[PDB]
Amino acid sequence: TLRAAVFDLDGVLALPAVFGVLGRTEEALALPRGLLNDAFQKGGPEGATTRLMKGEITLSQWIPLMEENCRKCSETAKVCLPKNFSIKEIFDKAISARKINRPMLQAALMLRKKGFTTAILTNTWLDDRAERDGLAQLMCELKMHFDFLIESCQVGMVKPEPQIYKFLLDTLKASPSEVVFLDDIGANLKPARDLGMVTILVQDTDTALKELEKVTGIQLLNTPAPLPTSCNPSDMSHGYVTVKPRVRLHFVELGSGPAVCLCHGFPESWYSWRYQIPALAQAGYRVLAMDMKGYGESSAPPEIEEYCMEVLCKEMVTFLDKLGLSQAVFIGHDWGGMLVWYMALFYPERVRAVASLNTPFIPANPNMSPLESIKANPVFDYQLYFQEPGVAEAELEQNLSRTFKSLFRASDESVLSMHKVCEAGGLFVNSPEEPSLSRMVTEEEIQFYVQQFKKSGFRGPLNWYRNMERNWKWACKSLGRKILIPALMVTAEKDFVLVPQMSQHMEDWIPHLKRGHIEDCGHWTQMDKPTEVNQILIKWLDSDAR
Amino acid sequence: TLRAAVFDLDGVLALPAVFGVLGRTEEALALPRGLLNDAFQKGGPEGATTRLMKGEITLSQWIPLMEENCRKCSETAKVCLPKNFSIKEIFDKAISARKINRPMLQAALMLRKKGFTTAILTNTWLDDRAERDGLAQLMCELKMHFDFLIESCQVGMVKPEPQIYKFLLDTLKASPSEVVFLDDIGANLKPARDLGMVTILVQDTDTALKELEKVTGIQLLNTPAPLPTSCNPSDMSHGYVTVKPRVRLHFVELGSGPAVCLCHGFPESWYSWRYQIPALAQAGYRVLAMDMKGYGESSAPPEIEEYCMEVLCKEMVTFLDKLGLSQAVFIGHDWGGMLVWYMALFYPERVRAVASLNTPFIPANPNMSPLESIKANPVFDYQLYFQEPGVAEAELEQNLSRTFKSLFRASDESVLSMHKVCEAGGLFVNSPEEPSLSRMVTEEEIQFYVQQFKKSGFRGPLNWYRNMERNWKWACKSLGRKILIPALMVTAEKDFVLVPQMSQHMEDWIPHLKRGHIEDCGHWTQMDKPTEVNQILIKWLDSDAR
Ligand SMILES: CCSc1cccc(-c2ccc(C(N)=O)s2)c1
Ligand SMILES: CCSc1cccc(-c2ccc(C(N)=O)s2)c1
C-alpha cells in the first residue's frame, strides 16, 4: 500500500525538460548529433557536471568547464563551433523557458490531500547566475506544495547513486514498497525499483498520470477544477503595528512587489482572503491582509466613535506611515469596500489604486438623514437591528459555530431571511440550531472564525454600522470631489443585499472606473468564487496598478 | 517662554517654493509679469484655488479650472499663450523639483529634542495625479519628525483664515505666546501675530534660523553633524514567522522595494541596526531587521546544535519561503556577518547580494581543527572562555546593565582586556562594577538591551560559538566554490578582534568583491559610525543590488 509519492523536477514537475535543449541546440545549429550532450556528460561521475550536481562547484564556475568540454568534443568530431556560441546564453534560455508542469503539480496536490507524503527529488545545481531569481521563484512556488525538497547539490549525492535513494527513504520514514517514484530518466528509476519502489517512466504527462492513478487508486486525470491555494494561519508571517496608544493592527503578509492592502468586511477576518493571498503574492505583489479594527488579533476598543470611517481611515494612513509605505493598492469587501472608497476620496496620495468587491460607491445624500436612507430599502433592515448596543452582540455571540455556519453560505444555500429581521427579533429566528456545513467552507475554516471571535466578540465589528450620522457628515465634505485614481468595481450577481444594480451610477463619480462581474456569486465573494476573484484582481492589478 | 514651533511646508520645510514657479514660468515664456499668478489667485476665497486648498475638490479637478482662469487673464492682457502650454506639465515639474530643506528640518529636529512640540501647518491639496507618489513620499519622510501635520485640505480651513490658527493652538494645547510660527508669506504670519504668537518671515533659510535661535535660546545654526534618524521600538511594524515547531523568528520591518535582511551579531538585537533601518527604507528598500535565533523576541532553544551555521541558514531560507520572498540582500555584522557569507555559499539563489561589516570570509582549513585555529590567535581567547556551558552565561547574566555598558563602547573607551580572559577567569574581572556610559549610547538604549536579554539570557546567543567542529565540517563542503554574486566587505580600522587585515585574502574566493573601510571605528560598527555605515551601504545597494 502506497502512502508516499516522489517526483523529479526536470521533465516531470517542470517542462520543457532543460536537458532536451542540448539536442534542440545541435539541430538548430546543424551540429553533429549528440556533440553538445557528450560535452555535458563528459567524465561521468568524475566530470565537471557531477561536481556541479553534488554542490562541489557553482553553476558560474561550471560554465567555463562545460565550454571547454565543448572545444574537445569538436576536435574529435571535425566541425568548428561558431563565434557567438554561448553555453551561458543557451542555459539562460532553457532555465527561463522551463515552467511548472501544472497537471503534474495538481496530481501531486491531490495525492497529498488524500494523506500522501510528497517529495521532490532532483539533481540540481547551486545557481549563482545574475539571472538566478527566475529559478529561485519557480522552486519557491513548487516546494511549498511538498513535504520535502531533496536537492542533489545540497545533499552532496546524486541520482542514480543508491545512497540518495536510502536518504530519500529515511527522509520519508517509509519502506520502498510504500513509495511511487516518477522520473523521466530510466537510469534514475532502476535503483528505486531494485529497492521495491513503484516507478513510473515519465514521457508524456497524461500517460504518466494514467499509470499514477492506476497504482494509487486515486483519480488524478479529468478531475474537477481545483480550488486556488489557501492559507494555513500558522505558516504565515504575522505583522503588528501600534497605530495609537492601545490600538494595534494585525496583518498577514506574503510576497514581494507593490503593496496590496486587503480589507475584509463584516463579520470577517484576514482569513476571508485565504484564497487571494497566495495567488496575489505569486502574481508579483506584496500582500498585507488585515484584521480590521474590532477583529481577530487587532485591537477592539468598546466605544462606538472608534469605528467611524474618519477614525478608521486615519488609522490606515498611520499603518502605512509606520510600515514606511508611501502608497498601497486598497482592495475591500463589504465594510472594507466602503473604507477603501473613502481612502480614495480622502487620501488619494496614499492609494495607488482602489478596488471593491460588492460594495458600491454611493455619495451621501446631503438632503436626507442616512437613517431615512437605510429605511427606504427593505434589504438593509438588518442594519437597523444592529443599531441597539447589545442586542445583535447577544444573538451573534450566543453560539459562534451556529453564527458562522448560518452566515457563510452560497446563494443557493440561504437559511437567513434578512428581511423583517427587527420584527422577527433576530437574524437566526428561522435558522436551525445546528445548520448544515455550506459547500463553500470546511468545518476547520468555521472553527478558525469561531476561535478569532472568542477574543473580542461582536461589539467592535457591530460598531462599524453604528456611525451612520458621523460618516454621513464626513462624507458630505467630499461631495464636490471625483475619484480619478485607478478604480475597479466588482459586482456579485446573487448578492441580495449589495445588488450589482446599486453600483450603476458609479461612473458619474469615477469616470474611468473599470468593472468586473461574477455570475452565480453570493455575498461572501472571496470564498464563493475564489478563482474568478483572483483572475479579475490579478488582471486589473497588472494593467492598472504596476 | 516658547515650547512649540510651527513650520510652513512650501518655502520653509520644502524648497524651491512651488509657487515661485509661476513667476519663473512667466519669465522663461516672456509672458506679462504676474499673468500666471493672477490665474492662480483668481476669485480669492471664492476661487477654484481656495476650493482646492479646503479639500472641496482634488488637484485633477482643479487643473482644468486653473487653465481656464489662464485663458481669461490673457484676454485682458492681449498676448496669447502657446499650444504646448500645460498647467499639469508646469506643476508636475515644480512638485518634482521641490525637496526637503534639510537645514530647516534639522532645526525643527533640534527643537523637538529639547522638549519642543513641533508641527507643520500647510495649505495643500488632495493630490490624485498619476505622479502623486513623489509628494506622498516627501510628506511621509517629513511628517514622522513632527508631533502634528495640519493640512488645509483635510481640515477644510486655510491660512490666512483665523479659524485654522485657533485650530492650531487647540491641537498644540498651548497659548499663542508659547508658539513660534515660521512662514514665507507675510499675509499668513499676521493672524499668528495678532494672537501674540512669535513669528518669523522666512526668506533665506540662514536668516530665518538666526531669528529662530535668538527667540528660542537654542543653538540651531553651525551645530555639529546630527546622528541619522534612530528607531523607537513601539513605533515599528513587528513581524513573526514560525520556521519550525517551537522556532519562531521576530523582525522589525520598514519601507518598500527590494528586501534587505539585516543580521546582527553577538550579543545584540534587531535594535543594533536602529540607525540603518530608517536610512535604508528612505533610500528605497524594504528593511527586515532580525532578532537572530537565541535573541530578543525570537525563539531561544537550549540545545547547542540548534545554533550551528547549517541549521541557522536553513531557518533563514524557510523565513524567506514563509514570507514569499524569492531573494533578499543579506547584510550581517559579527556572527550575522559569518551567517551571511554562508548563505551566499550555500544558497546563492536566495541571496540577491551579500554584505558584511567587520566579519571577513575565511575558508575552513581542512588540515586543521577549528579549535587549533582559534588558539593560534590571542585575540580569540574570549571564544574559548565561551565554550564551557554555563560559565560565560553566569558572568554575562549577572548584571545585564554592567554587561552592555562594559561591551558597548567606542575604541578609545575600552574597559575590557579581551586577551588572557580564560586565565583572568572572565571578561569583566578588570571592569568596574558601575561602568561609565559610552558616548555611543544613551542610558535608555542600554535599558532596551537589558529588557530584551531578560527573556532568554545568554545561553542561545553563546551557543553560536559552540558549534566550531560542526560548522567546520559543513564549511569544508564549500571548499571548491567561489562567491560570485555581488559582495561587499566593510572593515573597521579599530576592531581589535575582527581586524581589517584578516580580510586581505578575500579576493581569492570573491574575485568581484567590493570594499568599504571605516576609520576610527571599533567593533560595534553600526552605532560607532552610523553615518559612514549608511553612506557605504546605500551606495553599494544602489549600484550592486537594484
Ligand atoms: C450580516 C452579515 S453581512 C451580509 C450581507 C449580504 C448578504 C449576507 C448573507 C449572509 C448569509 C446569508 C445566508 N442566508 O446564509 S445571506 C450577509
Ligand atoms: C564579546 C562581544 S563580541 C566583540 C568583538 C570584538 C571587540 C569587542 C569589544 C567589546 C567591548 C570592548 C570594550 N572594552 O568595551 S572591545 C567585542
Map residue A420 onto helix, strand or coil: coil
Interchain contact, B484 vs A60, CB within 8 Å: yes
Q: Report the alpha-carbon distance of residue B398 to residue B418 in Å, rounded.
A: 18
The grid coordinates listed for B545 are 543590488
How long is chain A? Answer: 546
- Choose one of B418, B430, B494 to mutate for the ligand 2 pocket test, by most ligand atoms within 8 angstroms of C-beta: B418
Q: Do A229 and A297 contact (CB within 8 A), yes or no? A: no
Q: What is the 3-state secondary structure (H, E, C) of B455-488?
A: HHCCHHHHHCCCCHHHHHHHHHHHCCCCCCCCEE
- Tell me whether residues A349 and B239 touch, CB distance under 8 A: no
Q: Give backbone dihedrals phi and psi of A243, rounded to 5 degrees, phi first.
A: -95, -15
Question: Helix, strand, or coil here: B452?
Answer: helix
Residue ranges of B 28-57 with Cβ closer than 8 A to chain A: 51, 55-57
State the distance from the centre of ligand 2 to the C-alpha of B407, rounded, in angstroms: 5
Q: Whole-angstrom Cα distance, residue B75 to residue B79? A: 7
B482 to A286: CB separation less than 8 angstroms, yes or no: no
Q: Do B411 and B520 form a contact (C-beta atoms < 8 A)? A: yes
> What is the C-alpha separation between B31 and A2, in angstroms, rounded?
85
Residue type, B196: G
Q: Determine, for residues B126 and A326 on separate chains, whether the beta-carbon distance falls below 8 Å.
A: no
Phi-psi region of B486 (alpha: psi -120 to 50; beta: other; left: phi over 0): beta
Catalytic residue, candidates A449, A465, A495, A528: A465
Q: Which CATH architecture has domain A17-96?
A: Orthogonal Bundle (1.10)
Amino acid, res. A287? V
Separation CA B124–CA B108 (nearest Å): 20
- Is residue A260 within 8 A of residue A287, CB to CB? The reply is yes
Using the mean position of ligand 1's atoms as its centre, give its distance from the Cα of residue A331 in Å: 20
Q: How far apart are the first and last CA of chain A?
A: 50
Cis peptide leading into A82, omega within 30 of 0? no
Q: Give the span between the Cα atoms of A54 and A61, in whole angstroms.
A: 13
What is the rounded CA–CA span in Å between residue B277 and residue B280? 5
And the C-alpha cell for A90?
543557451
Annotated binding residue A382: yes
Cβ proximity of A176 and A169 under 8 Å: yes
How many CB atoms sit inside 10 A of residue A109's CB? Answer: 17
Kindly tell me the number of DSSP H helices and DSSP E strands found in chain A: 24, 15
H or E stretch at A352: strand A351-357
Q: Is the CB of B405 inside a 6 Å radius of any atom of ligand 2? A: no
Residue A385 bears catalytic tag: no
Single out the residue of A142, A152, A218 nearest to residue A180, CA to CA: A218
Q: Nearest CA to A155 among A140, A165, A143, A141? A: A165
Looking at CATH, the fold of the domain delimited by B1-16+97-217 is given as Rossmann fold (3.40.50)
Least Cα separation, residue A61 to chain B (angstroms)? 8
Contacts of B24 (CB under 8 A, 6+ apart): none
Distance from CA of B106 to the nearest CA of A (A): 20
CA A489 to chain centre: 21
| Closest C-alpha among A460, A463, A445, A467 to residue A526 | A445
User: Do residues B483 and B361 make contact, with C-beta atoms less than 8 angstroms apart?
Assistant: yes
Q: What angle is formed at CA A416 by the lines to CA A414 and CA A421, rounded to 5 degrees?
A: 155
A349–B143 CB contact, under 8 Å: no
Under DSSP, is residue A268 helix (H, G, I), strand (E, B) or coil?
A: coil
DSSP code of residue B33: T
Contact A147, A112 (CB under 8 A): yes
Q: What is the Cα–Cα distance from B281 to A486, expressed in whole angstroms?
A: 26
Closest by Cα among B138, B141, B171, B175 to B154: B171
Say how many C-beta atoms besides its own lie within 10 A of residue A236's C-beta: 23
* SS3 of residue B17 by DSSP: coil
Q: Smallest Cα–Cα separation from B475: which of B387, B386, B351, B370?
A: B370
B296's grid cell: 530578543
d(CA A278, CA A281): 5
Check if A257 contacts B (Cβ < 8 Å): no
Using DSSP, state whether B135 is helix, strand or coil: helix
In sequence order, what are the beta bridge partners of B515?
Answer: B489
- Cα dihedral value B522, B527, B528, B530, nearest 10: 120
Residues 305-324 of A with CB under 8 A from B: 321-324
What is the Cα–Cα distance from B104 to B202, expressed in whole angstroms?
10
Question: Within an 8 Å CB–CB cutoff, is residue A482 touching chain B?
Answer: yes
B429, β-bridge pairs: none
Stretch(es) of chain A classified as CATH 1.10.150.240? 17-96
Set of cell numbers at residue B531: 553615518
**Measured distance CA(A327)–CA(A347) in Å, rounded:** 10
Atom 12 in ligand 1: residue holding the nearest Cα: A407
Residue found by looking up cell 472564525 in the block: A449
Nearest chain A residue to B280, by CA = A324
Give me the numbers of helices (H) and strands (E) for chain B, helices first please: 24, 15
- Greatest Cα-to-Cα distance within chain A, rounded to the nearest angstrom: 94
Long-range contacts of A63-69 (CB under 8 A, 24+ apart): A63/A87, A63/A88, A63/A91, A66/A39, A66/A40, A69/A39, A69/A40, A69/A42
The C-alpha cell of B207 is what?
536668516
Angle separating helix axes A309-323 and A335-346, nearest 10 degrees: 70
Q: How many CB atoms lie within 10 A of CB B454?
A: 10
Q: How far apart are CA A242 and CA A236, in angstroms?
A: 20
Which residues, 6+ apart, have CB-to-CB distance to A17 below 8 Å?
A10, A11, A98, A184
CA of B272 to the centre of ligand 2 (A): 14
Q: Which three cell numbers stand for residue B61?
A: 479637478
Query: What residue ranges of chain A are covered by domains with CATH 3.40.50.1820?
Result: 236-546
Residue B317 Cβ inside 6 Å of ligand 2? The answer reads no
Q: Which of A358, A414, A417, A418 has most ligand 1 atoms within 8 Å of CB, for mutation?
A: A418
3 state DSSP class of A145: coil
Q: Which three cell numbers stand for residue A81?
A: 563551433
Task: Say which residues have a Cβ less than 8 Å from residue B421's Cβ, sequence separation at least 6.
Answer: B381, B382, B384, B385, B427
Contact A128 B348 (CB under 8 A): yes
Q: Which of B135, B235, B322 sits opposite A237 (nearest CB)?
A: B322
Angle at alpha carbon of residue B301, lines to B298 and B302, rounded to 5°: 140
Looking at residue B365, the DSSP 8-state letter turns out to be -
Q: How was this structure determined?
A: X-ray
CA–CA separation, B340 vs B329, rounded Å? 9
What distance lies between CA B93 and its chain's CA centroid?
28
Mapped onto helix, strand or coil, the DSSP state of residue A243 is strand
| Residues near A427 by beta carbon (within 8 Å), at least 6 away in sequence | A382, A385, A392, A395, A396, A406, A416, A418, A421
A534 annotated as belonging to a binding site for a ligand: no
Please indicate whether residue A334 is annotated as part of the active site. yes
| Identity of the residue in B58, B143, B327 whose CB atom sits nearest the CB atom of A133 | B327
Question: How far does chain B reach from its first CA to its final CA, in angstroms?
Answer: 50
- Longest CA span, chain B: 94
Whether residue A270 contacts residue A241, with contact meaning beta carbons closer than 8 Å, is answered with no
Strand partners, A284: none
Q: Please state, in angstroms and rounded to a whole number, the distance separating the CA atoms of residues A445 and A447.
A: 5
Q: Are A490 and A533 a contacting pair, CB within 8 Å?
A: yes
Cβ-contact A333, A526 below 8 angstroms: yes
Provide the CA B411 distance to its chain's centre, in angstroms: 24
Task: Please state whether beta strands A14-15 and A99-100 pair in parallel, antiparallel, or not at all (unpaired).
Answer: antiparallel
The one-letter code for the residue type at A354 is V
- SS3 for B205-259, per residue? HHHHHHHHHHHHCCCCCCCCCCCCCCCCHHHCEEEEEEEECCEEEEEEEECCCCE
* Interior angle at CA B514, CA B512 and CA B518, nearest 5: 160
A366 touches chain B (CB under 8 A): no
C-alpha cell at A536: 479579475
CA distance B254 to B288: 7
CB under 8 Å to B176, separation ≥6 — which residues?
B169, B192, B195, B196, B197
Q: Quick check: bond before A16 cis, omega within 30?
A: yes
Taking residue A507's Cβ as centre, other Cβ atoms within 10 Å add up to 12
Contact in structure between A450 and A407 (CB atoms under 8 Å): no
Cα A82 from chain centre: 46
What DSSP designation does A482 have? -
In a 13 Å sphere around the CA of A55, the CA atoms on its Cβ side amount to: 21
Q: Which long-range contacts (CB under 8 A, 24 or more apart) does A307-312 make?
A: A307/A460, A307/A463, A307/A464, A307/A466, A307/A467, A308/A467, A308/A470, A308/A471, A308/A474, A309/A338, A309/A339, A309/A342, A309/A467, A309/A470, A309/A471, A309/A474, A309/A475, A310/A470, A310/A471, A310/A474, A312/A339
Residues 6+ apart with CB under 8 A from A478: A345, A346, A363, A364
Distance from the Cα of residue A540 to its chain's centroid: 16
Q: How many CB atoms lie within 10 A of CB A356?
A: 29
Long-range contacts of A76-81 (CB under 8 A, 24+ apart): A77/A32, A77/A35, A79/A31, A79/A32, A79/A35, A81/A31
Grid coordinates belonging to B167: 485650530
The helix/strand/coil state of A54 is helix
* Cβ atoms of residues A516 and A488 within 8 Å: yes
Catalytic, B334? Answer yes
Helices A468-475, A309-323: crossing angle, 10 deg rounding: 70
| Closest CB from A128, A140, A322 relative to B235 | A322
Beta strands at B487-492 and B514-518: parallel, antiparallel or unpaired: parallel
For residue B413, give the H/E element and its range: none
3-class secondary structure, A256: coil
Contacts of A477 in chain B (CB under 8 A): 55-56, 156
Instruction: Tell me which long-range contacts B128-133 makes (C-beta under 8 A, separation of at least 24).
Output: B128/A348, B128/A349, B128/A483, B128/A484, B128/A485, B128/B58, B128/B59, B128/B60, B129/B59, B129/B60, B129/B88, B129/B92, B131/B92, B131/B95, B131/B96, B132/A348, B132/A349, B132/A485, B133/A326, B133/A327, B133/A349, B133/A352
- The answer to whether the Cβ–Cβ distance between B238 and A240 falls below 8 Å is yes
**Number of residues assigned to chain B:** 546
* Distances B385 to A448, B381, B457, B465, B544 between C-alpha atoms, Å: 49, 7, 17, 10, 39
Tell me the C-alpha distance between B94 and A468, whole Å.
Answer: 41
Cell for A117?
A: 507524503
Q: Which residues pair with A504 in a beta bridge?
A: none
Q: How far apart are CA B42 and CA A270, in angstroms?
A: 49
With a 6 Å cutoff on the Cβ, whether B409 touches ligand 2 is yes
What is the residue type of A538?
A: I
As a whole number of angstroms, the distance between CA A352 and CA A347 comes to 10
Superfamily of domain A236-546: Alpha/Beta hydrolase fold, catalytic domain (3.40.50.1820)
Instruction: Determine how many CB atoms are found less than 10 A away from the CB of residue A80.
Output: 10
What are the angstrom distances between the C-alpha of A520 and each of A373, A410, A494?
Answer: 28, 9, 6
Strand-by-strand arrangement of the B4-7 sheet: B148-151, B117-122, B4-7, B179-183, B198-201
B250, B264, B333, B523: the catalytic one is B523
Residues A424, A417: Cα–Cα separation, whole Å: 10
Cβ pair A521, A529 in contact under 8 A: yes
Confirm if B18 and B123 have CB atoms less than 8 A apart: no
Q: Which residues contact B425 (CB under 8 A, 6 or more apart)?
A: none
* Inter-chain touch A322–B237, beta carbons under 8 Å: yes
Place of cell 508646469: B90
Indicate which residue of B334, B381, B495, B528 is catalytic: B334
**Given strand A117-122, what is the order of strands in its sheet?**
A148-151, A117-122, A4-7, A179-183, A198-201
Give the residue among A431, A364, A436 at the shortest CA–CA distance from A395: A431
Residue B515 CA to residue B427 CA, distance in Å, equals: 32
| Crossing angle between the packed helical segments B102-113 and B205-216, to the nearest 10 degrees | 10
Q: Which residues contact A76 (CB under 8 A, 6 or more apart)?
A: none
Nearest CB among A56, A132, A133 relative to B480 is that of: A56
Kind and range of the H or E element at A427? none
